[PDB]
Design a protein. Structure first.
Ligand SMILES: *[C@@]1(=O)[C]N([C][C]([C][C]([C])[C])[N]C(=O)O[C]C2=[C][C]=[C][C]=[C]2)[C][C]1[N]C(=O)[C]([C][C]([C])[C])[N]C(=O)O[C]C1=[C][C]=N[C]=[C]1
Length: 215
């Protein structure tokens, strides 16, 4: 495994989105992971639909919150997820209106990464690619973050409240780090991204609830 990885360069990462006034971060996390497998699978970097997930994933709560695992599971038994086009995002949950002809990807199951192991996570990201993760994002530093390797001592590993997307890792001046994609706009953090501390004892709980779809 390399000492550096960034799937932004290789082309596994689409543009940053905004979830708006809805708790759909678990959707944008699931869609990111799915997108990344696509580019590897069928060379195409398409923008999937976080809204199809919001409305149809009955095991979740939609704008109230949910798990990525449920969202991947749904994409399997329902045999498919659309392109943003066939189900654009309106940040309002609504009655399920999935569309066969829309279909732009599918996944056959999901794998969960060993709870709390950042060594397994670095490997999953080096070998598989973009991985869905959860984190504690209540800290005010997180919202006002602007540059550098993020680390705050009040980040609770047991209070996962936001889902995000890990798309690589590397080291900035002696400080190892996870490269994270957020769904809060490009006007947040560093152009929609944040460098989170790595190896520093499960910072914020980044390796506690991580997964990826199988294609
Ligand atoms: C996110 O949007 C979706 N939700 C997911 C949460 C944990 C996941 C594992 C990450 N699950 C959950 O709450 O489970 C509910 C459930 C489970 C099973 C069945 C039924 C229901 C958490 C949620 N996160 C947020 O909404 C965050 C919270 C931060 C502040 C901690 N807020 C956010 O993104 O704010 C939106 C915003 C608006 C404007 N400008 C910037 C940001």
């Amino acid at each position: 495994a390399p000492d550096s990885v960034d799937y932004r360069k290789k082309g596994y990462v689409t543009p940053v989105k905004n979830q708006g006034q809805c708790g759909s971060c678990w959707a944008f996390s699931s869609v990111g992971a799915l997108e990344g497998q696509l580019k590897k699978k069928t060379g195409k970097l398409l923008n999937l639909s976080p809204q199809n997930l919001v409305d149809c994933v009955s095991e979740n709560d939609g704008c109230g919150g949910g798990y990525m695992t449920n969202a991947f599971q749904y994409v399997q038994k329902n045999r498919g997820i659309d392109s943003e086009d066939a189900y654009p995002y309106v940040g309002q949950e609504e009655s399920c209106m999935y569309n066969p002809t829309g279909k732009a990807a599918k996944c056959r199951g999901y794998r969960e990464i060993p709870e709390g192991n950042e060594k397994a996570l670095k490997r999953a990201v080096a070998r598989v690619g973009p991985v869905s993760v959860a984190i504690d994002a209540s800290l005010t530093s997180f919202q006002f973050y602007s540059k550098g390797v993020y680390y705050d001592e009040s980040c609770n590993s047991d209070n996962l409240n936001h889902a995000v997307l890990a798309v690589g890792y590397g080291i900035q001046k002696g400080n190892k780090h996870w490269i994270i994609k957020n769904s809060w706009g490009e006007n947040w953090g560093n152009k929609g991204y944040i460098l989170m501390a790595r190896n520093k004892n499960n910072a914020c709980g980044i390796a506690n609830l991580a997964s990826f779809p199988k294609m």
